[model samples]
Target: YSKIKISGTIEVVTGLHIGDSPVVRDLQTKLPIIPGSSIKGKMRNLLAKHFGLQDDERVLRLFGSSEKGNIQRARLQISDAFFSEKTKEHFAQNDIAYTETKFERQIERVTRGSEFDFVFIYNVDEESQVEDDFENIEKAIHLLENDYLGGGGTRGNGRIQFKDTNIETVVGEYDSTNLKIK
Candidate 1:
């Protein structure tokens, strides 16, 4: 972590998946449609590039846009609450904890199958007191990259899983030299 490293808003352009699908319908309406799996996959891919993984484009495109090219989410302002729940459910399911202001977002894809795009921001600062230093953050990054997700063929244990996945690998090895703190 640099002296002024920050985690704020970022553009996570999801590819198209298709409308009218159960997931789309449920996600748009908050009925367990857009599983945490889908959201996690999108976020991991976008953050991978920031870490130095230059292979996200290839990986994200692996499924092909035509088959399921629906950009599930976009312009998400990741917050602590957003990060804690998703993170806990997806990865840290056991003793998940968070603090300060580092988390994830829920961008509603253009599927237009739902109403307003639901943005989920997780907060951990209220949960406990954690350092923003490199060591703690590094641990947080590692936990998110290594512990939370799994590779899959479709759902929870399929193509959506983050484990052994390209995005996780990249984010896991990402460098934070450019980060600075005020």
Candidate 2:
């Protein structure tokens, strides 16, 4: 068994509105957030059209699909994205709210320049699966970069940029040199 952990920041380039709910908030902090499920499903949906047989074995195993009516587990997991301590400090120091809802075509959105830390945990049973699967995830990242993270994206909404990434082999039998994302 192998586990690869990827940590990074997602920076909002434009206004980000990941929703359908009237109000989005963390129950405890009552703060705005980018849900991990939303990010995972978005990347999974984008990678859904990435390859051929990969659509079945690799993609299904990586993101999980029940095309044959059987349950398959997702190999990768995403952490809910939230503001960094420094950013939070800046907000506190400046007395700025973490979120501001500006109406856009009737939809409310958090302003741009908000940064959130993200973690992606990738697990696989084989080293080979690690190779192709990680590569596929890289492609998904690129696609998401070209595409959008939350919502159907509408127009000029949810544009996020990934930066300062660090991927480590938590416990694995895979070669670290072969694992790289662009």
Candidate 3:
């Protein structure tokens, strides 16, 4: 059989919206951009929780998630998450050769050989279409600043989870069932 080789391939999920918009004392009734620190914090906390670390100091030492408001700048820089081990095995079985690499340049070199490469990297919120005049969003933020976050947090808390049940499609947005990427 002729050798078939597809080397150095990685499929990454780009455009992870990291970082909450400026905690406007009044930006409710709208979609808030996610922050990286929030993402990293959750990752660390979940990992720590998984590890069974209950003490605050011990947990903090073992899993030091960022405390400051710099999630936008904290790079996730993962490569494995782009393609699972099973997917990689499938690719290899199909004679498709490949190697994984971080999509983020900031931490690529340092995390090149580590599992961290699989973590998805993200950038600051860049979309300008987000409405800036939503009053209800501001109201929600005001009510839940301490617990405000995109992903689900401890005690089954989170703000954006509201999106889980309140799903909708914009007027002109492309429908998934209608279109499939080849």
Best by TM-score: 2
TM-score of 3: 0.22
Better of 1 and 3 by TM-score: 1
**Tens digit of lDDT per residue, candidate 1, span 1-182?**
11121332211122223221222434332422334345445445444544452243322322113225554222122222122234335334554222112112332232111112222322221212213332333332343433322222142221111121111111223343443222
Q: Rank the candidates by TM-score, best first.
A: 2, 1, 3
Model 2, TM vs. native: 0.85
CA lDDT for candidate 1: 0.28
How far is each candidate from the true structure, as Cα RMSD in Å? 17.5, 2.7, 21.0
| Clash tally, candidates in order | 39, 0, 20
**Candidate of highest lDDT:** 2
Better of 1 and 2 by TM-score: 2
Local accuracy of candidate 3 as per-residue lDDT tens digits, 1-182: 11111112222222121221222111442322233345345445544444462234323432233565332222122222222355446655776433223332321111111111122322212222112211222222233333433322353323221111111222234221321111
Worst lDDT 10-window in candidate 1: 161-170
**Runs off by more than 4 Å, candidate 3:** 1-31, 53-75, 78-119, 122-182
- Alpha-carbon error at 53 in model 1, in Å? 5.2
Give RMSD (Å) of candidate 3 vs. truth.
21.0
